[PDB]
């Protein structure tokens, strides 16, 4: 309810990135708290783009590739495979405040160890410090609908519904960010 807890998509207002299918933070668990996004889903070494806060709150920097933003209500968002982090621990931000970019290379994207296909943001929803399901969560005019397995991207099950337009938006297609809803 708090406007400052209202969420937008985690890239700049006025811009469009391609989401993949919802999944858990680990990629093999439950609930489906996360989706990935990238402008073009390119190979390592390509240009990458600005990640922004989905909502207002307190920044905590967990490594050079991971950032958390926590709203006073207890809702929070996690941002992973980051680079060029331009916020500090304890810093106050609002929706659309730039946090950094998603990392363009293996070394920078996987600063904590592990695997990935190529440059993208790994974005997650939390409440009370725990990862929670994205099901029914709103980002601007979009209501997210979660699929039936990790990374499920079949548009009959996984999609964003735009309440301002009556349109359904699928994985691996540009998703426009109009910012916060009134
Ligand atoms: Zn992910």
mmCIF file of C-alpha atoms and ligand atoms in Angstrom:
data_model
loop_
_atom_site.group_PDB
_atom_site.id
_atom_site.type_symbol
_atom_site.label_atom_id
_atom_site.label_comp_id
_atom_site.label_asym_id
_atom_site.label_seq_id
_atom_site.Cartn_x
_atom_site.Cartn_y
_atom_site.Cartn_z
ATOM 1 C CA UNK A 1 0.000 0.000 0.000
ATOM 2 C CA UNK A 2 2.695 2.494 0.943
ATOM 3 C CA UNK A 3 3.510 4.315 -2.317
ATOM 4 C CA UNK A 4 7.221 3.970 -1.529
ATOM 5 C CA UNK A 5 6.744 0.204 -1.438
ATOM 6 C CA UNK A 6 4.901 0.228 -4.732
ATOM 7 C CA UNK A 7 7.161 -1.415 -7.331
ATOM 8 C CA UNK A 8 8.341 -0.684 -10.859
ATOM 9 C CA UNK A 9 10.456 -2.896 -13.149
ATOM 10 C CA UNK A 10 14.213 -2.887 -12.242
ATOM 11 C CA UNK A 11 15.387 -0.977 -15.335
ATOM 12 C CA UNK A 12 15.034 2.704 -16.244
ATOM 13 C CA UNK A 13 11.553 4.130 -16.745
ATOM 14 C CA UNK A 14 11.006 4.593 -20.494
ATOM 15 C CA UNK A 15 13.065 1.521 -21.373
ATOM 16 C CA UNK A 16 12.367 -2.086 -22.374
ATOM 17 C CA UNK A 17 14.190 -5.305 -21.394
ATOM 18 C CA UNK A 18 13.385 -8.976 -22.043
ATOM 19 C CA UNK A 19 12.392 -11.091 -19.010
ATOM 20 C CA UNK A 20 12.826 -14.859 -18.780
ATOM 21 C CA UNK A 21 10.624 -17.352 -16.875
ATOM 22 C CA UNK A 22 10.079 -17.073 -13.107
ATOM 23 C CA UNK A 23 12.261 -19.226 -10.834
ATOM 24 C CA UNK A 24 13.552 -19.607 -7.271
ATOM 25 C CA UNK A 25 16.636 -17.728 -6.068
ATOM 26 C CA UNK A 26 18.770 -20.883 -6.348
ATOM 27 C CA UNK A 27 17.162 -21.810 -9.691
ATOM 28 C CA UNK A 28 16.074 -25.264 -8.491
ATOM 29 C CA UNK A 29 13.825 -24.610 -5.499
ATOM 30 C CA UNK A 30 10.519 -23.041 -4.531
ATOM 31 C CA UNK A 31 8.882 -20.485 -4.438
ATOM 32 C CA UNK A 32 9.424 -18.729 -7.782
ATOM 33 C CA UNK A 33 10.704 -15.471 -6.274
ATOM 34 C CA UNK A 34 12.899 -14.411 -9.192
ATOM 35 C CA UNK A 35 13.020 -13.501 -12.855
ATOM 36 C CA UNK A 36 15.982 -12.569 -15.026
ATOM 37 C CA UNK A 37 16.100 -9.666 -17.465
ATOM 38 C CA UNK A 38 18.396 -8.436 -20.183
ATOM 39 C CA UNK A 39 18.008 -5.940 -23.024
ATOM 40 C CA UNK A 40 19.057 -8.480 -25.677
ATOM 41 C CA UNK A 41 20.299 -11.656 -23.901
ATOM 42 C CA UNK A 42 23.710 -11.421 -25.612
ATOM 43 C CA UNK A 43 27.035 -13.261 -25.302
ATOM 44 C CA UNK A 44 29.695 -12.406 -22.704
ATOM 45 C CA UNK A 45 31.651 -9.269 -23.672
ATOM 46 C CA UNK A 46 28.604 -7.369 -24.934
ATOM 47 C CA UNK A 47 27.265 -3.983 -23.830
ATOM 48 C CA UNK A 48 25.043 -4.047 -20.740
ATOM 49 C CA UNK A 49 22.591 -1.569 -19.227
ATOM 50 C CA UNK A 50 21.400 0.235 -16.100
ATOM 51 C CA UNK A 51 19.709 -1.631 -13.266
ATOM 52 C CA UNK A 52 17.514 0.508 -10.994
ATOM 53 C CA UNK A 53 15.737 0.125 -7.647
ATOM 54 C CA UNK A 54 12.243 -1.336 -8.056
ATOM 55 C CA UNK A 55 11.051 0.566 -4.947
ATOM 56 C CA UNK A 56 12.241 2.848 -2.113
ATOM 57 C CA UNK A 57 14.332 1.610 0.790
ATOM 58 C CA UNK A 58 17.704 0.970 2.419
ATOM 59 C CA UNK A 59 20.540 -0.413 0.271
ATOM 60 C CA UNK A 60 22.816 -3.188 1.482
ATOM 61 C CA UNK A 61 25.742 -4.231 -0.739
ATOM 62 C CA UNK A 62 26.436 -7.965 -0.424
ATOM 63 C CA UNK A 63 29.379 -8.165 -2.895
ATOM 64 C CA UNK A 64 30.516 -6.393 -6.090
ATOM 65 C CA UNK A 65 27.750 -8.311 -7.929
ATOM 66 C CA UNK A 66 24.871 -8.383 -5.409
ATOM 67 C CA UNK A 67 22.666 -5.632 -3.894
ATOM 68 C CA UNK A 68 19.544 -5.659 -1.685
ATOM 69 C CA UNK A 69 16.970 -2.844 -1.224
ATOM 70 C CA UNK A 70 14.663 -3.143 1.799
ATOM 71 C CA UNK A 71 11.477 -1.110 2.335
ATOM 72 C CA UNK A 72 10.388 -0.268 5.929
ATOM 73 C CA UNK A 73 7.248 -2.431 5.453
ATOM 74 C CA UNK A 74 9.579 -5.433 5.178
ATOM 75 C CA UNK A 75 9.166 -5.978 1.441
ATOM 76 C CA UNK A 76 12.517 -6.090 -0.362
ATOM 77 C CA UNK A 77 14.206 -6.829 -3.671
ATOM 78 C CA UNK A 78 17.512 -8.518 -4.497
ATOM 79 C CA UNK A 79 19.688 -7.742 -7.536
ATOM 80 C CA UNK A 80 22.321 -10.269 -8.637
ATOM 81 C CA UNK A 81 25.008 -10.523 -11.381
ATOM 82 C CA UNK A 82 25.502 -6.753 -10.912
ATOM 83 C CA UNK A 83 28.568 -4.670 -11.794
ATOM 84 C CA UNK A 84 29.581 -0.995 -11.380
ATOM 85 C CA UNK A 85 27.567 -0.702 -8.152
ATOM 86 C CA UNK A 86 27.078 3.011 -7.404
ATOM 87 C CA UNK A 87 25.239 2.776 -4.079
ATOM 88 C CA UNK A 88 26.595 2.212 -0.530
ATOM 89 C CA UNK A 89 25.474 0.235 2.549
ATOM 90 C CA UNK A 90 22.755 2.138 4.358
ATOM 91 C CA UNK A 91 22.025 4.492 1.426
ATOM 92 C CA UNK A 92 18.390 5.552 0.956
ATOM 93 C CA UNK A 93 16.967 5.169 -2.560
ATOM 94 C CA UNK A 94 13.632 5.494 -4.379
ATOM 95 C CA UNK A 95 12.141 3.601 -7.341
ATOM 96 C CA UNK A 96 14.192 4.211 -10.531
ATOM 97 C CA UNK A 97 17.385 5.160 -8.621
ATOM 98 C CA UNK A 98 20.279 3.577 -10.534
ATOM 99 C CA UNK A 99 22.060 0.799 -8.612
ATOM 100 C CA UNK A 100 24.616 -0.139 -11.292
ATOM 101 C CA UNK A 101 24.523 -2.312 -14.429
ATOM 102 C CA UNK A 102 24.208 -6.052 -14.971
ATOM 103 C CA UNK A 103 27.660 -7.549 -15.507
ATOM 104 C CA UNK A 104 29.051 -8.002 -19.031
ATOM 105 C CA UNK A 105 31.594 -10.759 -18.298
ATOM 106 C CA UNK A 106 31.926 -14.144 -16.522
ATOM 107 C CA UNK A 107 34.416 -12.810 -13.949
ATOM 108 C CA UNK A 108 32.282 -9.827 -12.919
ATOM 109 C CA UNK A 109 28.845 -11.521 -13.188
ATOM 110 C CA UNK A 110 29.917 -14.507 -11.090
ATOM 111 C CA UNK A 111 31.856 -12.643 -8.407
ATOM 112 C CA UNK A 112 30.588 -15.077 -5.728
ATOM 113 C CA UNK A 113 31.262 -18.214 -7.853
ATOM 114 C CA UNK A 114 28.834 -20.309 -9.927
ATOM 115 C CA UNK A 115 27.413 -20.500 -13.464
ATOM 116 C CA UNK A 116 25.563 -18.388 -16.011
ATOM 117 C CA UNK A 117 24.730 -18.319 -19.741
ATOM 118 C CA UNK A 118 25.549 -14.646 -20.389
ATOM 119 C CA UNK A 119 24.799 -11.054 -19.281
ATOM 120 C CA UNK A 120 21.537 -10.519 -17.372
ATOM 121 C CA UNK A 121 20.093 -9.246 -14.090
ATOM 122 C CA UNK A 122 18.806 -11.841 -11.594
ATOM 123 C CA UNK A 123 15.961 -10.088 -9.769
ATOM 124 C CA UNK A 124 14.135 -11.432 -6.690
ATOM 125 C CA UNK A 125 11.225 -10.547 -4.374
ATOM 126 C CA UNK A 126 11.499 -10.871 -0.580
ATOM 127 C CA UNK A 127 9.425 -10.204 2.519
ATOM 128 C CA UNK A 128 10.732 -10.254 6.093
ATOM 129 C CA UNK A 129 14.175 -11.321 4.795
ATOM 130 C CA UNK A 130 12.779 -14.467 3.110
ATOM 131 C CA UNK A 131 12.346 -15.122 -0.622
ATOM 132 C CA UNK A 132 8.635 -15.147 -1.518
ATOM 133 C CA UNK A 133 6.577 -16.039 -4.602
ATOM 134 C CA UNK A 134 6.185 -13.467 -7.400
ATOM 135 C CA UNK A 135 2.651 -14.769 -8.085
ATOM 136 C CA UNK A 136 0.255 -11.817 -8.306
ATOM 137 C CA UNK A 137 2.921 -9.192 -7.565
ATOM 138 C CA UNK A 138 2.604 -5.873 -9.413
ATOM 139 C CA UNK A 139 5.277 -3.887 -11.237
ATOM 140 C CA UNK A 140 3.672 -0.666 -12.456
ATOM 141 C CA UNK A 141 0.510 -1.694 -14.355
ATOM 142 C CA UNK A 142 1.816 -5.290 -14.783
ATOM 143 C CA UNK A 143 0.613 -8.222 -12.713
ATOM 144 C CA UNK A 144 3.044 -11.152 -12.913
ATOM 145 C CA UNK A 145 1.846 -14.704 -13.402
ATOM 146 C CA UNK A 146 4.269 -17.474 -12.464
ATOM 147 C CA UNK A 147 4.777 -20.753 -14.422
ATOM 148 C CA UNK A 148 4.792 -24.360 -13.160
ATOM 149 C CA UNK A 149 8.543 -25.107 -12.994
ATOM 150 C CA UNK A 150 11.807 -23.171 -12.583
ATOM 151 C CA UNK A 151 12.341 -20.996 -15.676
ATOM 152 C CA UNK A 152 8.979 -22.062 -17.197
ATOM 153 C CA UNK A 153 8.479 -19.532 -20.002
ATOM 154 C CA UNK A 154 5.419 -20.941 -21.797
ATOM 155 C CA UNK A 155 3.259 -17.819 -22.241
ATOM 156 C CA UNK A 156 0.070 -19.734 -21.524
ATOM 157 C CA UNK A 157 1.382 -19.989 -17.908
ATOM 158 C CA UNK A 158 4.126 -17.350 -17.484
ATOM 159 C CA UNK A 159 3.309 -13.747 -18.410
ATOM 160 C CA UNK A 160 2.860 -10.154 -17.300
ATOM 161 C CA UNK A 161 -0.664 -8.760 -17.615
ATOM 162 C CA UNK A 162 -0.835 -5.009 -18.291
ATOM 163 C CA UNK A 163 -3.894 -3.662 -16.452
ATOM 164 C CA UNK A 164 -3.528 -0.296 -18.240
ATOM 165 C CA UNK A 165 -3.688 -1.844 -21.734
ATOM 166 C CA UNK A 166 -5.488 -5.211 -21.425
ATOM 167 C CA UNK A 167 -2.437 -6.881 -22.966
ATOM 168 C CA UNK A 168 -0.397 -9.954 -22.035
ATOM 169 C CA UNK A 169 3.409 -9.836 -22.233
ATOM 170 C CA UNK A 170 5.562 -12.948 -22.737
ATOM 171 C CA UNK A 171 9.153 -14.021 -21.978
ATOM 172 C CA UNK A 172 12.048 -13.007 -24.256
ATOM 173 C CA UNK A 173 10.197 -10.018 -25.686
ATOM 174 C CA UNK A 174 10.828 -6.370 -24.752
ATOM 175 C CA UNK A 175 8.814 -5.260 -21.721
ATOM 176 C CA UNK A 176 8.297 -1.478 -21.477
ATOM 177 C CA UNK A 177 8.700 0.204 -18.059
ATOM 178 C CA UNK A 178 6.271 3.101 -17.389
ATOM 179 C CA UNK A 179 7.419 3.379 -13.730
ATOM 180 C CA UNK A 180 5.105 3.316 -10.685
ATOM 181 C CA UNK A 181 1.301 2.996 -10.776
ATOM 182 C CA UNK A 182 -0.960 5.556 -9.017
HETATM 183 ZN ZN1 LIG B 1 17.756 -15.821 -12.208
#
